[PDB]
């Protein structure tokens, strides 16, 4: 009952995607007329936009006023009447279940059964159960079992690593042995920061433009591994290392390394240092304490 970490068993789902986006094309085409193939699916899905540190959204202003009803019964069935027969042609080529699916989604009914729920694969079905038990155990705080699941899973030759947050929070709550969550994360960044589609939303990403979740979370969580303190010049040595200039969050990580190292004229230079990086962190999309609070800690230091 959880997402599976495998490419979905194929044929019928793809030919259904065909029927769907093809009919979609015919209806929206005739709709723009009245307002006047993997590749067909491709163009179709294509022409469309593809007090705490909230990476805020884009709110409501500068957006256009209105519309008033476009679609009566007669007018809609006008748009619908013809593209449904065009569909009658290749429906004759697809399978009866697929045809039924086309009939029902085109009535507007939504199918009872998931792609997983109708999938049936023998190595893949076993991997489905494996991954499932991983997610279930991780939900169940069963970090021991869950760890066994994870190791046995990553063993298998089919799994590339979405599963990393599983192991980040996994080894995190594990505390047991193995070179830990931080080690894993900095490994992720060291292996996958160099040249050395379906599956991919944002929580796993490529390093052309922002790889987000895992990077920022090892960043902050490492600054909290300095909350353990009051290793740092290491963390900001390899936060110093990378150029991926649209961060600023590593500027606040940097200035936090200088506030943690500031806890004699050396300590002075560290306090002037954090004073600098807080403004070169006003460079970008701001992470702000009132920051006169930051400075007030810095005057408790100036003591």
């Amino acid at each position: 009952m959880f997402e599976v970490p495998i490419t979905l068993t194929n044929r019928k789902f793809a030919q259904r995607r065909k029927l769907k986006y093809q009919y979609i094309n015919y209806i929206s085409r005739r709709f723009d007329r009245i307002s006047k193939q993997q590749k067909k699916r491709r163009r179709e899905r294509h022409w469309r936009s593809v007090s705490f540190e909230i990476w805020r959204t884009v709110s409501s202003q500068n957006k256009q006023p209105i519309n008033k009803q476009k679609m009566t019964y007669h007018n809609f069935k006008k748009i619908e009447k013809i593209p449904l027969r065009k569909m009658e042609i290749p429906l004759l080529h697809c399978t009866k279940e697929n045809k039924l699916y086309f009939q029902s989604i085109s009535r507007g009914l939504e199918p009872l059964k998931t792609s997983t729920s109708e999938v049936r694969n023998y190595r893949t079905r076993h991997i489905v159960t494996l991954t499932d038990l991983l997610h279930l155990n991780v939900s169940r705080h069963n970090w021991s079992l869950a760890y066994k699941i994870f190791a046995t899973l990553i063993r298998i030759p089919g799994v590339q690593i979405k599963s990393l947050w599983g192991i980040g929070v996994e080894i995190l709550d594990n505390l047991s042995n193995s070179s830990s969550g931080l080690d894993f994360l900095q490994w992720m960044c060291q292996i996958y920061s160099s040249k050395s589609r379906s599956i991919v939303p944002p929580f796993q990403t490529g390093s052309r433009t922002h790889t987000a979740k895992f990077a920022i979370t090892y960043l902050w969580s490492s600054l909290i591994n300095c909350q353990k303190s009051m290793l740092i010049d290491k963390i900001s040595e390899w936060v110093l290392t990378p150029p991926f200039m649209e961060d600023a969050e590593v500027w606040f990580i940097y200035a936090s390394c200088h506030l943690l190292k500031a806890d004699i004229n050396q300590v002075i230079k560290h306090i002037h240092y954090v004073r600098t990086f807080l403004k070169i962190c006003l460079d970008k999309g701001g992470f702000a304490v009132p920051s006169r609070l930051i400075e007030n800690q810095l005057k408790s230091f100036e003591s």
Partner: protein, 377 residues
């Protein structure tokens, strides 16, 4: 690069090679007899001779994996060995007996038309196995050439022990068996076609055996006017049957539950126990080394950077004994409920174990139940 239009020869070589590979695993790892192999050369020889008594350069052959398992079961059944289809389903779904690949990851590059003729039709899980063994049983004739009587009584034993039924039900069901059949059980259901619509949901012997078994339990328990079987012990039987415990077997049935087509059985993986999952990952690292298809060793060390991570559980006749005892207290209309839930749990186990459908099973036991009422009324 790859062959054209007479890779029939290479096809039949990867196929025959994969067969003898599986035989190696079952004499070796299953302690079969060496005679099996000869019985296999004879059957695979008969149908090889029949597809090379066929002309066309258009191949028209279907050597799917169901044919491998089909001639293995065929040969085993001639030899009267007490192996049944569910043994094969378990064996292959647990990756022990290599199956789910063409020449598994390590071989040969063939025309993608034949790699598809292998990888396709892989599942046995809607009775594809019964249908393919009957199909082979037509392809070369069962009757004179071989002895196609199933190993019935060992299946009864397998079944009583598979529940926790007291040993009287072996003789009960054995008797209803004799009552409708007088113990004559065939293998062909063949009139080469697709087409069928009456008489022939129920003539794979096994499925009828399970049908008699179910029926027997229902009749027997609902008409113990003696009151030999307590209103309670049917519940205690249901609960000792239901308690998910971690033996090799149940762990296996979980592994089969994972690749069974229909819900609920996948909701069944949802309701799984930590030891079952553990022995599962064990069987995963053991029998999914039978997988399919510089930087590689860099990822063996790379993954080996973060850890992959007086004999306890009991044997088969031990479990069988202990539920036979769990009912050993042997010596009012809502007990029909207990009968029903027990029958439906037993059914569930049979459905995953013998790779058929809900609807398939109940079609059969319905038909043959009317086949007992008709020869009783």
């Amino acid at each position: 690069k790859l062959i054209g239009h007479e890779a029939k020869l290479l096809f039949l070589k990867s196929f025959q090679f994969i067969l003898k590979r599986q035989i190696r695993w079952l004499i070796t790892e299953m302690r079969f007899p060496k005679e099996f192999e000869h019985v296999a050369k004879i059957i695979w020889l008969k149908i090889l001779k029949t597809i090379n008594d066929q002309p066309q350069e258009e191949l028209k052959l279907q050597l799917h994996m169901t044919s491998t398992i089909s001639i293995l079961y065929l040969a085993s059944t001639h030899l009267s060995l007490p192996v049944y289809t569910c043994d094969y389903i378990k064996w292959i779904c647990t990756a022990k007996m290599p199956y789910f690949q063409a020449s598994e990851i390590l071989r040969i590059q063939l025309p993608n038309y034949y790699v598809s003729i292998l990888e396709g039709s892989i599942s046995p899980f809607n009775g594809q196995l019964y249908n393919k063994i009957a199909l082979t049983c037509g392809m070369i004739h069962f009757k004179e050439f071989f002895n196609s009587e199933i190993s019935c009584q060992g299946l009864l034993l397998k079944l009583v022990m598979q529940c926790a039924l007291p040993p009287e039900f072996y003789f009960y069901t054995k008797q209803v068996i004799e009552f409708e059949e007088t113990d004559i059980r065939n293998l062909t259901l063949w009139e080469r076609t697709d087409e069928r619509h009456t008489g022939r949901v129920s003539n794979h012997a096994e499925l009828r055996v399970l049908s008699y078994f179910m029926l027997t339990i229902n009749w027997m328990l609902s008409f113990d006017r003696d009151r030999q079987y307590p209103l309670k012990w049917i519940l205690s039987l249901t609960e000792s049957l239901t308690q998910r415990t971690t033996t090799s077997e149940s762990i296996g049935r979980n592994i089969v539950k994972v690749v069974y087509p229909d819900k609920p059985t996948s909701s069944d993986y949802f309701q799984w126990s930590e030891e079952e999952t553990l022995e599962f990952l064990k069987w995963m690292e053991k029998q999914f080394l039978p997988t399919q298809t510089d930087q590689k060793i860099a990822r063996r060390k790379l993954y080996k950077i973060f850890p992959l991570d007086s004999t306890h559980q009991l044997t088969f006749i031990e479990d069988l004994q202990e539920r036979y005892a769990k009912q050993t207290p042997f010596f009012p209309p809502a007990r029909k409920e207990a009968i029903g839930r027990l029958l439906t749990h037993i059914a569930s186990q049979l459905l995953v174990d013998f790779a058929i459908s809900k609807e398939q099973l109940k079609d059969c036991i319905s038909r043959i139940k009317n086949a007992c009422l008709h020869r009783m009324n």
